[PDB]
Amino acid sequence: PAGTGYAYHQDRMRRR
Amino acid sequence: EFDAIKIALASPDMIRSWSFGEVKKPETINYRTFKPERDGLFCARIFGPVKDYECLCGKYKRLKHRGVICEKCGVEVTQTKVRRERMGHIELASPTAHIWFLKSLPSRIGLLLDMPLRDIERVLYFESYVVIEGGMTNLERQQILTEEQYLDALEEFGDEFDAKMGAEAIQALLKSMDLEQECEQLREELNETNSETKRKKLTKRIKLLEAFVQSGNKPEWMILTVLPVLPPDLRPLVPLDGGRFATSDLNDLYRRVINRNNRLKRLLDLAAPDIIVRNEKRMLQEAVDALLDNGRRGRAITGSNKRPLKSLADMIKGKQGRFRQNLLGKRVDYSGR
Amino acid sequence: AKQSMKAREVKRVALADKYFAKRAELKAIISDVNASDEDRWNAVLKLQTLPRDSSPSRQRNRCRQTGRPHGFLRKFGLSRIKVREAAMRGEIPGLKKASW
Amino acid sequence: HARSTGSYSLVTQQPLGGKAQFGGQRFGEMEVWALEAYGAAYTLQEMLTVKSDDVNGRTKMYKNIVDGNHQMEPGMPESFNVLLKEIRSLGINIELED
Amino acid sequence: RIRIRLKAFDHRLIDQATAEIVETAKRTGAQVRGPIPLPTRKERFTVLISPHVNKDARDQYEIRTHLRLVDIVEPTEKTVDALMRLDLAAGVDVQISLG
Amino acid sequence: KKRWYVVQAFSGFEGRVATSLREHIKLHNMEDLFGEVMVPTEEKFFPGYVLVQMVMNDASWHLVRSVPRVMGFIGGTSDRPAPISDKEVDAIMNRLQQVGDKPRPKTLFEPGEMVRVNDGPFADFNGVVEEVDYEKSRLKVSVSIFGRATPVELDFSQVEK
Ligand SMILES: [Zn+2]
């Protein structure tokens, strides 16, 4: 949840 | 797929729900052929078939009836990696308290039952007695008892009087420990005192007393009653180049716990005197404590030659455990040097 | 045979199955020379009280297919006529026409 | 030394170590820190799930590479399941929620 | 010693079974006693063949139960257990008896 | 008066411990301080404990613990170790063979149809027993041989419930 995966974790944290 | 990882204590119902069969016999394998042991550590019915979709002994050699279990085989019928996820459980004859909750510094059972570590170990290694709701006598609940203290009490308070020892007694104490009641008391004790040292000693005890009530962790889950065994695939038995099997250390640990547990069941089933059995339960306690975290008790056991053998906690901790050696750093395909 | 007869037979069989233990015991009691006279008498009377169809000497062996009382064979459970048919068809194992 | 796809170890499904055993180079801990230090996230995900540990993940990967696809189905490291079995073999009840 | 009593209605079938059993014995163990033929039971039956009446009209059937006595003198580990696997022809009642 | 005590030996060397104990008695000639030495046996409880008729002096205590392959006594404490009882000796005298009596001169293991044969010709095998000859000590366990439930006269001790 830092690099390229920060967009993925934004998406997963938004979709809860 | 999944959020947070939750860690908690393991209830005996939870350990029986993990399990797929009681591991009785300590006999590892046949060793003169290739077959295992029915039903020993490396069982068939309790875990699974060595070969994929095959009864190890003889039936189902195609892909039609995956599951049937004949009486001649006492074997499940699934994948080769099915045994890696399946775990067994050892019905410990005598209760044995966990070493991780008895010697963690500070011990989990040390600041919960308001008893010094030294006194906790004495009773735990069959060297001291502990009272449990005696009755109308002149004795406390936490106060312990020695051979001379018990002998005299035995002839004195022969009636309503309870004074056990070992994990059994400890378990009872924890089991009969009103968590909620202690909270208020501790909280009231902290608000009715000014002692600096006491304040810190009371705030550290009430913190672990209210945290246990916040979760679904019971006080009687500290003592191990239904010891769980790691999957065979995870304790692999491969031979090196030759004709002998280079056996792992965990198989020595589990095989000793099962040898001692069978001895303790046989001594308990022969209606022998009530004291006999203290050495037997103490050897089982030390065997379980050596299986879980080896060497935290006095000098660690050893197979070959003087080097101690590696236990489960030593498969976790250290520079060569699972975190620092297989999960943070991995060996990697498509790589060169 | 009729259906009714068959039914009756079945009933008898059932009764026999039921009352065997008691009846046998009673018989034993009656026999036993080393026993009281009054007891023996009671046993005899007790037996009378029990149903008649409870006796095994009441039930007739009938053919299992047709219920024909006569011409029966025990090994096959069939009346002669049916047995023969079975033999002809190949339905009784091992059985063939014998000459010597 | 060089390795595309060789043998795999038995207790933890990771490649073997060394040269005589046809093995792969250890992508150690400080290299994991050095890829956290960039923003390389997919490179580290395939560097410790697809290329190394997950067996169904790497067979899906091998089919996808020989068909031109270039895509990973991630899954879980099998050695993390080994960590679950070793912690679970104590009196500890570790799980996976939700 | 393991005595084995093969019983069947078909003689050929019985013979086949016996041979098979011998084979099973002989590879694993040693000194198979042998396939000894006992007397055959010729259980005869007469029946009236008419539906109603004709008494001299009769069919005389029989069932020839054949016996084969196979004995095994040395029961080893491997041999006795083998029996379970080796499946023989149907309609042959076997009867093994150790001692 | 000599009271009883329990000794722990290395389990398996128990007869040799008993012989060495009798010999140490007749070496250090404290003959008036030892009565017997019991290792009971059924057609073997207790699994590793030696019963000694004895008295308690510290000299005789050092004697029994100086006997080789002996760990120590089993009692409440190690200062004054514990004798066992005497009220349970009257009931044990009337009965000394509860795991091998003639109370049940027939069934040694539940028949039904679940048993395993190991002391007979077909070892490491199980089968279903329809009828049984307890009177003549015989079993008609129909083991699975050549895809058939063939019975075989087995011995009660030869089979296992
Ligand atoms: Zn099978």
Cβ–Cβ under 8 Å, residues F34 and F54: yes
Provide the token pair at B221. 């889950």
Give 3-state DSSP helix, strand, coil % of chain D, rounded to 5. Answer: 40, 10, 50
* Bridge partner residues of B131 (DSSP): B163
Burial of B35 (0-12, 13-18, 19+ CB in 10 A): middle
Cβ–Cβ under 8 Å, residues F51 and B255: no
Which residues does chain C break after (C to N > 2.5 Å)?
A: none
Provide the token pair at E38. 């006992």
Q: Is the dihedral of CA E4, E8, E10, E13 positive or negative?
A: negative
d(CA B89, CA B227): 6
C100: nearest CA in chain E?
E60
DSSP symbols for chain E? -EEEEEEES-HHHHHHHHHHHHHHHHHHSS-EEEEEE---EEEEEEEE-SSSS-TT-EEEEEEEEEEEEEEES---HHHHHHTTTS---SSEE--EEE-
- No. of helices (H) and no. of strands (E), chain A: 1, 0
d(CA E94, CA F151): 8
Inspect the structure and tell me whether chains E and D have 3 or more CB pairs less than 8 Å apart: no
Count of residues making up chain E: 99
Of the CA atoms within 13 Å of residue B220, those in its CB half-sphere come to: 15
Contact residues, E window 29-68, toward F, CB-based 8 Å cutoff: none
Nearest to B238 among D10, D96, D98 (CB): D10
Give the three-state DSSP class for D58: helix
Cα–Cα nearest to C30, from C18, C48, C14: C48
d(CA B134, CA F22): 44
**What are the angstrom distances between the C-alpha of C33 and each of B15, C39, C71, D91?**
65, 11, 40, 71
In Å, how far is E94's CA from the nearest CA of chain C? 17
Contact residues, A window 1-16, toward D, CB-based 8 Å cutoff: 2-6, 8
The answer to whether residue D32 neighbours chain B at the CB level (below 8 Å) is: yes
Q: Which residues of F touch B125 (CB under 8 A)?
A: none
* Domain assignment of residue D28, given as a range: 14-98
Angle at C13 between CA C7 and CA C19, to 5 degrees: 135
Only one residue has tokens 């098979």, namely E20
Cβ–Cβ under 8 Å, residues B232 and B224: no
d(CA F52, CA F73): 10
Provide the token pair at D71. 């895509």
Q: Which residues of F touch B148 (CB under 8 A)?
A: 77
SS (H, E, C) chain B: CCCCCCEEECCHHHHHHHEEEECCCCCCCCCCCCCCCCCCCCCCCCCCCCCCCCCCCCCCCCCCCCCCCCCCCCCCCCCCCCCCCCEEEEEEEEEEECCCCCCCCCCCCCCCCCCCHHHHHHHHCCCCEEECCCCCCCCCCCCEECHHHHHHHHHHCCCCCCEECHHHHHHHHHHCCCHHHHHHHHHHHHHCCCCHHHHHHHHHHHHHHHHHHHCCCCHHHCEEEEEEECCHHHCCCEECCCCCEECCHHHHHHHHHHHHHHHHHHHHCCCCCCCCCHHHHHHHHHHHHHHHCCCCCCCCCECCCCCECCCCHHHHCCCCCCHHHHHCCEECCCEEC
In Å, how far is E92's CA from the nearest CA of chain F? 9
Task: For residue B87, report the distance from its CA to the centre of ligand 1, in Å.
Answer: 21
Q: Is residue D36 part of a domain?
A: yes
Give chain C's radius of gyration (CA, Å). Answer: 20
d(CA B57, CA B59): 7
CA dihedral E80, E86, E90, E96 (to 10 degrees): 0
Only one residue has tokens 């191990």, namely B224
**What are the angstrom distances between the C-alpha of F114 and each of B59, B126, C22, F127, F128?**
20, 42, 31, 7, 6
d(CA F39, CA F149): 45
Q: Is the dihedral of CA B329, B330, B332, B336 positive or negative?
A: positive
Cβ–Cβ under 8 Å, residues B58 and F124: no
Name residues whose C-beta falls within 8 Å of residue F84's C-beta, 6 or more positions apart in sequence.
B273, F4, F5, F6
Give the three-state DSSP class for F35: strand
Of the CA atoms within 13 Å of residue F102, those in its CB half-sphere come to: 0
Nearest to F45 among B150, B270, B278 (CB): B270
Asked if the Cβ–Cβ distance from F8 to B279 is below 8 Å, we say yes
d(CA C64, CA F158): 43
d(CA C80, CA E58): 10
* Bridge partner residues of E60 (DSSP): E46
d(CA B5, CA B15): 18
DSSP F33: G
Cβ–Cβ under 8 Å, residues B130 and B123: yes
Helix C20-31 / helix C3-18 crossing angle, nearest 10 deg: 60
Q: Do the bridges between strand B19-22 and strand B129-131 make them parallel or antiparallel, or are there none, so unpaired?
A: unpaired
Amino acid at B155: E
Cα–Cα nearest to E85, from B34, F144, D98, F133: F144
Q: Do the bridges between strand F49-54 and strand B238-239 make them parallel or antiparallel, or are there none, so unpaired?
A: unpaired
d(CA B120, CA D22): 53
Give the three-state DSSP class for F19: helix
Cβ–Cβ under 8 Å, residues E6 and E94: yes
Burial of B13 (0-12, 13-18, 19+ CB in 10 A): exposed
Taking domain E1-99, whether its CATH number is 3.30.70.600 is answered by yes
Cβ–Cβ under 8 Å, residues E68 and E35: yes
Cα distance between the two ends of chain F: 46
Of the CA atoms within 13 Å of residue D57, those in its CB half-sphere come to: 19
Q: Do the bridges between strand B19-22 and strand B87-97 make them parallel or antiparallel, or are there none, so unpaired?
A: parallel
Beta-carbon contacts below 8 Å between B and D: 154
Residue F87 falls in which region: left (phi positive, over 0), alpha (psi -120 to 50) or beta: alpha
Q: Is the dihedral of CA B207, B211, B214, B218 positive or negative?
A: negative
Task: For residue C56, report the distance from its CA to the centre of ligand 1, in Å.
Answer: 46
Cα–Cα nearest to B50, from B89, B24, B73, B81: B81
Task: For residue F144, report the distance from its CA to the centre of ligand 1, in Å.
Answer: 13
Q: Where are the beta strands (DSSP E) in chain F?
A: 3-9, 34-38, 49-54, 70-73, 115-117, 125-133, 138-144, 149-154, 159-160
D31 φ, ψ to 5°?
-70, -35
Of the CA atoms within 13 Å of residue F27, those in its CB half-sphere come to: 11
Cβ–Cβ under 8 Å, residues B247 and B28: yes
Cα–Cα nearest to B182, from B137, B212, B162: B212
d(CA E80, CA E29): 9
**What are the angstrom distances between the C-alpha of F140 and each of E77, F127, F153?**
21, 10, 5
Cβ–Cβ under 8 Å, residues D44 and D32: yes
Resolution in A: 6.0
Q: Which residues of B272-295 are buried (b: 16+ CB within 10 A; e: fewer)?
A: bbebbbbbbbbbbbbbbbbbbbbb
Cβ–Cβ under 8 Å, residues B327 and D79: yes
Q: Is the dihedral of CA B89, B92, B98, B99 positive or negative?
A: negative
Q: Which residues of E touch C80 (CB under 8 A)?
A: 47-49
Helix B166-175 / helix B278-292 crossing angle, nearest 10 deg: 70
Residue B165 falls in which region: left (phi positive, over 0), alpha (psi -120 to 50) or beta: beta
Of the CA atoms within 13 Å of residue F105, those in its CB half-sphere come to: 3
Provide the token pair at E41. 């039971």
In Å, how far is B224's CA from the nearest CA of chain F? 25
Q: Is the dihedral of CA B133, B139, B145, B148 positive or negative?
A: negative
d(CA B35, CA B42): 10
Cβ neighbours of A14 (radius 10 Å): 7
Does F46 sit behind a cis peptide bond, omega within 30 degrees of 0 on the bond before it? yes
Cα–Cα nearest to C63, from B332, B305, E47: E47
Amino acid at B82: V
Cα distance between the two ends of chain C: 36
Number of separate domains in chain D: 1
C41-47: long-range pairs with CB below 8 Å, 24+: C47/C23
Nearest to B337 among D1, D52, D80 (CB): D1
Task: For residue B84, report the distance from its CA to the centre of ligand 1, in Å.
Answer: 21
d(CA B189, CA B114): 14
Residue D60 falls in which region: left (phi positive, over 0), alpha (psi -120 to 50) or beta: alpha
Name residues whose C-beta falls within 8 Å of residue F64's C-beta, 6 or more positions apart in sequence.
F7, F21, F52, F54, F70, F73
Which residues does chain B break after (C to N > 2.5 Å)?
A: none
B70 is in an annotated binding site: yes
Cα–Cα nearest to B74, from B48, B42, B35, B41: B48
Q: Is the dihedral of CA C33, C34, C37, C43 positive or negative?
A: negative
The answer to whether residue B226 neighbours chain D at the CB level (below 8 Å) is: no
E46 φ, ψ to 5°?
-105, 145
**What are the angstrom distances between the C-alpha of E96 and each of B174, E92, F150?**
61, 13, 7
Asked if the Cβ–Cβ distance from B272 to F45 is below 8 Å, we say yes
Asked if the Cβ–Cβ distance from B273 to F85 is below 8 Å, we say yes
B183 is in an annotated binding site: no
d(CA F57, CA F73): 13
Q: Best of E47, E48, E54, E58 to disrupt the C interface by mutation (most C CBs within 10 Å)?
A: E47
Burial of F9 (0-12, 13-18, 19+ CB in 10 A): buried
Asked if the Cβ–Cβ distance from D27 to B329 is below 8 Å, we say yes
Cβ–Cβ under 8 Å, residues B109 and B117: no
B57 is in an annotated binding site: yes
Name residues whose C-beta falls within 8 Å of residue B274's C-beta, 6 or more positions apart in sequence.
none
Q: Which residues of C touch E48 (CB under 8 A)?
A: 71, 80
Burial of C79 (0-12, 13-18, 19+ CB in 10 A): buried
In Å, how far is B221's CA from the nearest CA of chain D? 8
Count of residues making up chain B: 337
The answer to whether residue B326 neighbours chain D at the CB level (below 8 Å) is: yes
Which residues does chain F break after (C to N > 2.5 Å)?
A: 43
d(CA B86, CA B79): 12
d(CA D30, CA B203): 40
E50: nearest CA in chain C?
C81
Cβ–Cβ under 8 Å, residues B270 and F46: yes
Cα–Cα nearest to D90, from C88, B94, B296, B97: B97
- No. of helices (H) and no. of strands (E), chain C: 4, 3
